[PDB]
Design a protein around this ligand. Structure first.
Ligand SMILES: [Mg+2]
Ligand SMILES: [Mg+2]
Lengths: 144, 134, 539, 144, 134, 48
RNA sequence: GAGAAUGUCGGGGAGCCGAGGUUGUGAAUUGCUUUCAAAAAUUUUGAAAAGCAAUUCACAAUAAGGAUUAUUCCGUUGUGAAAACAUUCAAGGCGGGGCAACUCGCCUU
DNA sequence: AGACAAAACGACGCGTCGTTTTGTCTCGGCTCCCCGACATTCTC
């Protein structure tokens, strides 16, 4: 049964039970996701506000006024995806470390900025799993 | 409810009878024991001695009488110079006015009264300049 | 660039080394070409500095003729501890070091009314510093000071390339080949020749005349730039771009307070002195809860039940307040609550009387009471009244923040009594403590700093209320710290004194005068030329 | 010599991360307020004192609203009386007590939401609770 | 033992160049950390704005620097006005000079330095005036 | 006491110093046969 | 000594999240103390309030503060008087990836 | 002489600088960049 109903049952059988930090501290996000889902689909058949696409578009526009692309994406979904996959359970990806990658000591590029000066942009180093560096490395081994 | 201060302008328009209405305004500005800065008294002495060419003795009598009975002198604050320099980056007034505002603020004054200081304006979200003669 | 090395420690070390080299260059050679004929480097984990600083410093002492080529200049000559210790033993630097450090050992002897801290000898017919074996855990006579660093630097500098070659490649394969260096550098192979006749006396004169410069971190507020993504209207189209924050917004560069948060309570059954409040915090009921601490529990009924239990266990909290004992109390709460029912107890609110300030003024922040964080009492104001008495105060970091935000000085220049401020003190500051007979009111003339003058220089270490603690600037580590068992130490319990170490034992704060040194330990004072330049730079 | 977080930069980074997590939770809550106010799900007593015009979704300054405790003439009252009655019926059927905290109703509703019709305010309370307790989750996934 | 005060003249000769000897003697006089009034700083600001047309920011920076380091400001005594009126009966001086002597006297100063104001003349048998440039 | 009153009045000053050592501004001076109004415990007489 | 290649052991920085703890609000129960407050023999019982609590739940905050409506943030780091910075930073084009936002490569100044 | 000045006075609380003593936020997962040291091979 769902974790909420499990907690309710454990509170039924032992009314002195400490829930927060004792009974359930940490569980996989799948339980909260599935419970909130089941709740929202089951409550959906009874509340007409969860079917009114006018209200759904209103929430879409309010939340993403300046992003028409994202509005177009979410105009196809419904309240279920908006509540779980968008608001509550939205986890951002890791920031890119590509900008911190080293540079080759040989290849340079020159360009002139708005200040009239001439400065150099670096060229990022090659990933090792690239087949082309594979060729470089193992030819080096052939010669060695 | 609010510590109200004044400047040399109120005293000067009070002193003169040429404009009866402004003189009046000024005098009912003084009845409520408005606070005052020592620099205001110094400028008042300067203008009485310079513009009006009045004798030293009688202007000194008037200053002592006003300070004893009329206006409440405010102790000169030691951070007046640094604070006036701080207000100097964000505001563009005559530096004498900036010292007046700095000393008024450092003494916890809520309302300042004057003419040549852009009434209604807020100085470091602590004190506002009001033209009362209007 | 920041974070370009192994760890912040070595980066700070290298950066400060560079800064000091630039300062000495400016002061002693005015930044001209090839002012440093040669540079010698030594370290004494840390090996990361042995090569990086040498490579960086090769750029000053390198020769462009083409003879000096490589990763490092041939003029850079790293040494080893063998050379430095052998030169120190041979040339008498060790003897002057013991003579310099011994009075601390006589002070320790007098304080412990023994003679075990000085050992007489007859080969030198004198007293040498020493420590009892039970205070000899990791004691080192060099490490307990700051100027040993400079002494090591000196003994390194006079060591030429011939000396390091001789003491690193002593294996000659023939006595004659290295006999030239033996005769040139060592007296006849017994002792090495001094760099000059008056080396030892000059070294003594300098070592007893060095003031130590301590870097300071008084960063309280600084400016911070905030870039945030936002949709901006440009050319009739909305585009996502970064925008810089409008208005002013400062960043506090110190921890504002301590993590633990307490709440205010009012107890009729305790007397509260004026200027202090009672703050209560929840803590686990455990084995360290004796009668005095049980009486410091804010709930009276919990106190009744808990003392009943403790009496039931023969007055032994360890047996009473073990987890098993706590469980036994919880199961049978009736037989210690006069038979009355009560909920179980695991944590109780203990109250303390003191000075705790509100964290903020919005919402429920006005109910959180915290304590000043470690190392955040940074300013100690010293004022004078027209009569002449000195007044002391410690301003918390809150008023420092607010004052520095309004462009003012960190410390108010007058106190509530109208007393004019002498000045403010910060950790790592330097002050001069004049003799009881000297009258220092307009002394200045800090050019004739002699041994007596420099020995009366004290460095601030910490402050609290109206108390300021000082350590002599030449002291790094104590001969013996303080332990609550023996109740002895070099500088009593705090390991720092509110007074001088000397026999007069005078309050330092009542007669001290603040001083200002540069990176090189040279005093800075007002002079005519300086006064001219103040407003020549504005002229 | 041994190494144990020997950097003040690391401590600053830790505080920054904690703060960032805190404001992201707050932002999720704000967006939930906005959407639920659009849906007409918040009650009048609660919704009257969230700003929706200048401070989008934030509470009015110097106010600590609770979704469940209605304050009338300085007294506090619970609003879900009927679900509270049903929960106490469940306990007395289990035969434990007849006197329990009011705020235990949330778990009763969470069990009820799986297969029954609950009013909209309970559903908003449940969504905010889920926003409070999200659960552990690895971004990569990579089922082993 | 004596408490040395100074006037606007010493600072003005210190600042200017064309009087190298006067500027010199002024700068040595500033080395002994002589006490100053708040008035003297006020007329220093006024003369820098009028005679020397310096901008406000630099003026405030310089006055803050000097008040911090070289000169020691003295508090504005509250009896300055009554005591200045006291010397008015017996002494023949400009009223600003009477105020500067009043505040110097009330602050326990024994010697005042300036070109003007009747060199070598003891005021109320407690303060002296010395022209130091001579 | 009368002494510093004497030299204060001789120096042309006011009988009583207008600020104390703490710098607190002088409210006023009282003499024998003076009259004061003592307001009620609830009244707030500040600029009445 | 330098470069490149392959493995081993460390350190630093940044990032995406989780669970407590604490302080405060509200509630359920049960206590200690005091005062009102009656009954009874200075003492015992009863109603109410306040102070302090304990067990459980929901909630508010979690460095004071300042932005912003992007599904974005700045606030415990270094430098140093500029209260100014550093830690994001050009233009194009030719492409791969998805419901697309967004992400990832190649080429020329 | 009588009525002001001020010293006692019995009260508690306070406060005393001098010194020592006490207290002080905690763990969990994972990704992805950079550098350093020691190993081996080849070339200038
Ligand atoms: Mg003006
Ligand atoms: Mg004059």
């Amino acid at each position: 049964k769902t974790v909420g109903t499990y907690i309710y049952e454990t509170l039924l059988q032992n009314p002195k039970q400490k829930i927060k930090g004792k009974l359930v501290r940490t569980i996989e996000r799948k339980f909260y996701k599935e419970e909130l889902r089941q709740i929202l689909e089951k409550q959906k058949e009874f509340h007409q506000e969860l079917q009114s696409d006018d209200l759904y578009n209103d929430c879409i526009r309010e939340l993403y006024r300046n992003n028409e692309v994202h509005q177009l994406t979410l105009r196809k979904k419904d309240f279920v995806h908006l509540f779980m996959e968008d608001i509550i359970f939205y986890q951002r990806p890791l920031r890119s470390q590509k900008s911190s990658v080293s540079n080759c000591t040989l290849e340079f590029r020159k360009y002139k900025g708005e200040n009239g000066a001439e400065h150099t942009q670096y060229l990022k180093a090659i990933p090792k799993s690239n087949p082309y560096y594979q060729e470089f490395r193992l030819w080096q081994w052939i010669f060695n | 409810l609010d510590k109200i201060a004044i400047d040399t302008n109120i005293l000067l328009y009070a002193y003169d009878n040429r404009d009866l209405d402004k003189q009046d305004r000024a005098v009912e500005i003084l009845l409520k024991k408005p606070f005052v800065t020592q620099l205001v008294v110094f400028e008042f002495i300067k203008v009485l001695e310079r513009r009006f060419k009045m004798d030293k003795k009688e202007i000194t009598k008037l200053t002592i009488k006003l300070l004893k009975e009329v206006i409440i002198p405010l102790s000169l604050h030691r951070d007046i110079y640094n604070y006036s320099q701080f207000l100097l980056q964000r505001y563009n007034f005559g530096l004498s006015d900036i010292l007046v505002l700095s000393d008024s603020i450092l003494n916890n004054c809520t309302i300042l009264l004057s003419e040549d200081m852009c009434n209604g304006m807020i100085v470091d979200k602590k004190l506002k300049i009001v033209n009362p003669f209007l | 660039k920041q974070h370009s090395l192994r760890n912040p420690i070595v980066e700070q070390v290298i950066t400060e080394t560079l800064r000091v080299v630039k300062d000495i260059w400016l002061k002693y050679g005015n930044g001209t070409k090839d002012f440093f004929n040669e540079i010698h480097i030594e370290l004494g984990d840390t090996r990361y500095i042995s090569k990086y600083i040498s490579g960086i410093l090769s750029n000053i002492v390198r020769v462009e003729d083409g003879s000096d080529e490589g990763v490092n200049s041939k003029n850079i000559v790293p040494g080893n501890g063998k050379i430095t210790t052998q030169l120190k033993q041979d040339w008498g630097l060790n003897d002057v070091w013991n003579d310099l450090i011994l009075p601390r050992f006589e002070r320790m002897n007098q304080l412990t009314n023994s003679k075990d801290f000085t050992a007489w000898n007859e080969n030198h017919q004198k007293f040498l510093p020493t420590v009892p074996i039970e205070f000899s855990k990791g004691f080192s006579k060099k490490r307990i000071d700051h100027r040993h660093h400079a002494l090591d630097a000196l003994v390194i500098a006079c060591a030429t390339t011939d000396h390091v070659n001789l003491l690193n490649n002593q294996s000659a394969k023939s006595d004659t080949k290295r006999y030239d260096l033996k005769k040139k550098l060592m007296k006849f192979p017994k002792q090495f020749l001094k760099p000059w006749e008056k080396f030892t006396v000059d070294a003594k004169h300098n070592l007893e005349s060095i003031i130590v410069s301590f870097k300071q971190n008084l960063r309280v507020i600084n400016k911070a730039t905030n870039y945030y993504e936002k949709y901006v209207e440009k050319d009739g189209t909305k585009n996502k771009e970064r925008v810089e924050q409008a208005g002013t917004n400062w960043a506090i560069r110190k921890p504002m307070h301590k993590d633990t948060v307490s709440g205010k309570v009012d107890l009729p059954w305790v007397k509260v002195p004026k200027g202090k409040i009672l703050t209560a915090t929840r803590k686990s009921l455990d084995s360290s809860f004796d009668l005095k601490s049980i009486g410091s529990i804010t709930d009276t009924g919990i106190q009744k039940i808990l003392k009943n239990y403790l009496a039931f266990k023969d007055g032994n909290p360890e047996l009473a307040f073990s987890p098993e004992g706590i469980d036994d109390l919880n199961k049978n709460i009736e037989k210690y609550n006069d038979g009355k029912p009560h909920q179980p107890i695991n944590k109780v609110r203990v109250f303390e009387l003191g000075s705790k300030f509100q964290v903020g003024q919005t919402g429920n922040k006005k109910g959180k009471y915290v304590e000043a964080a470690k190392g955040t009492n940074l300013f100690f104001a010293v004022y004078e009244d027209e009569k002449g008495k000195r007044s002391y105060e410690t301003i918390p970091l809150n008023e420092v923040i607010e004052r520095q935000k309004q462009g003012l000085t960190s410390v108010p220049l007058e106190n509530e009594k109208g007393s004019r401020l002498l000045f403010d003190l910060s950790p790592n500051d330097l002050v001069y403590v004049p003799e009881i007979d000297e009258n220092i009111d307009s002394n200045f003339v800090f050019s004739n700093l002699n041994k007596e003058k420099i020995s009366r220089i004290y460095k601030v270490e910490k402050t609290s209320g109206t108390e300021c603690y000082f350590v002599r600037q030449d002291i790094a580590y104590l001969i013996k710290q303080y332990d609550a068992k023996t109740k002895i130490g070099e500088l009593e319990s705090q390991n720092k004194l509110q007074v001088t170490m000397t026999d007069d034992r005078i309050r330092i704060t009542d007669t001290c005068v603040k001083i200002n040194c540069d990176r090189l330990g040279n005093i800075n004072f007002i002079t005519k030329e300086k006064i001219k330049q103040i407003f020549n730079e504005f002229r | 010599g041994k190494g144990n977080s020997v950097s003040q930069t690391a401590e600053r980074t830790k505080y920054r991360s904690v703060r960032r997590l805190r404001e992201r939770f707050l932002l999720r809550r704000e967006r939930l307020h906005r959407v639920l106010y659009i849906l007409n799900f918040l009650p009048e007593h609660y919704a009257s004192q969230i700003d929706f015009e200048k401070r989008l979704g934030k509470f009015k300054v110097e106010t600590e609203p609770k979704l469940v405790w209605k304050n009338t003439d300085g007294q506090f009252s619970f609003l879900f009386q009927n679900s509270f009655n049903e929960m106490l019926e469940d306990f007395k059927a289990a035969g434990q007590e007849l006197k329990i905290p009011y705020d235990w109703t949330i778990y009763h509703l969470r069990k009820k939401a799986i297969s029954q019709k609950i009013e909209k305010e309970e559903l908003a309370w449940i969504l905010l609770n889920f926003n409070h307790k999200r659960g552990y989750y690895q971004l990569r996934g990579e089922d082993f």
